[PDB]
Design a protein around this ligand. Structure first.
Ligand code: CA
Length: 352
């Protein structure tokens, strides 16, 4: 099946005639993908010659520990990452239990890509696009069960005062359908975009069963399109959460927000506010703002906050199938399903 629980419908590299390769390092992943471009004669096949399922068994904990030991030294270093450019045959990059990376995965102009069980933390090159996961012009991508972290901190002297670390799951271009699910994302300033700029609007993206903890902004920063956010556990949001902009429509349901500032908002442009449909969250009305430590701030430019906690628009009928658990259950159970080492386990009502 291609069931992801969201907009993306894909099995990645887990399809017929797929080649199974074990990568012991970042270079091993790079080499496997490059070999995968040639046929039996050594001639290049457009989009890849065959489907790939790469099991990453490398471990770069020394580097992640070193980066955590001096986080401000990260921005200036060379960014590291495995580019998955123009690979359309179906590819799955899955980390083995215990594997870790101090490099990110960069998906560009591809389709049918699955990234699972990868622990990516404290990446170098925040000043030069050292994203942890990047999806650009890539539809049918599944970013599932990964642990993406760093330090939710901004150092002084960084170019643009926004480059201490890069994003966790930036999505842009024609990544028409993407599902970001069961990821443990913590200690991350800029979590993820949905459109690199005001003009890059569109895409249908689903964020489900993600555990955001100690993150500052972009859960995501939506620009146009549709965003379906369900069963996500949003704790300790230091800046803003879902920022629905450029007339994007969101459906926020069965999520558990807590200790969050501006959890649902539309700010930073001053116009073209997006809309949201709120249903089944742990917060039902403003009265729960005190109960769940939900706080709101203003902005220098016109903005709209979900301080009334009422829907500001509508949402199309959800295409794919999904069965969401209660907000309380995500709060209870989700921390043991989200992330790596959970053997890609999913949260069902049976487990509530
Ligand atoms: Ca980025």
């Amino acid at each position: 099946a291609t069931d992801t629980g969201g907009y993306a419908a894909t099995a990645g590299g887990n399809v017929t005639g797929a080649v199974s390769k074990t990568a012991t390092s970042m270079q091993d992943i790079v080499n496997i993908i490059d070999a995968a471009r040639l046929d039996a004669n050594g001639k290049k096949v457009k989009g890849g010659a065959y489907p790939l399922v790469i099991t990453y068994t490398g471990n770069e904990d020394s580097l992640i520990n070193a980066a955590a030991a001096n986080i401000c030294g990260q921005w200036s270093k060379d960014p590291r990452g495995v580019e998955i450019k123009e690979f359309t045959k179906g590819i799955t990059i899955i980390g083995a239990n215990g594997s870790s990376a101090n490099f990110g995965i960069w998906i560009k102009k591809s389709s049918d890509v699955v990234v699972q069980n990868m622990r990516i933390g404290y990446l170098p090159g925040g000043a030069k696009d050292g994203d942890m996961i990047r999806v650009d012009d890539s539809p049918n991508v599944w970013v599932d069960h990964n642990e993406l972290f760093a330090a939710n901190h901004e150092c002084d002297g960084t170019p643009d005062n926004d480059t201490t670390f890069e994003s966790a799951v930036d999505i842009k271009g024609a990544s028409n359908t993407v599902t970001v699910s069961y990821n443990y994302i913590h200690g991350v300033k800029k979590v993820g975009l949905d459109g690199s700029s005001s003009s890059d609007t569109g895409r249908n993206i689903t964020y489900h069963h993600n555990y955001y903890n100690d993150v500052n902004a972009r859960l995501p920063l939506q620009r146009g399109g549709l965003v379906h956010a369900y069963n996500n556990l949003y704790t300790n949001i230091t800046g803003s959460g879902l920022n629905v902009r450029q007339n994007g429509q969101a459906l926020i349901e069965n999520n558990w927000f807590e200790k969050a500032i501006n959890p649902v908002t539309s700010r930073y442009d001053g116009k073209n506010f997006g809309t949201w449909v709120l249903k089944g969250n742990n917060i039902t009305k403003p009265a729960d703002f005190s109960t769940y430590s939900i706080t709101w701030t203003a902005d220098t430019k016109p903005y709209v906050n979900a301080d009334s906690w009422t829907s500001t628009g509508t949402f199309p009928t959800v295409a794919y199938n999904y069965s969401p658990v209660s907000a309380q259950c995500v709060k209870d159970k989700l921390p043991g399903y989200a992330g790596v080492g959970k053997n890609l386990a999913t949260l069902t009502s049976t487990a509530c």
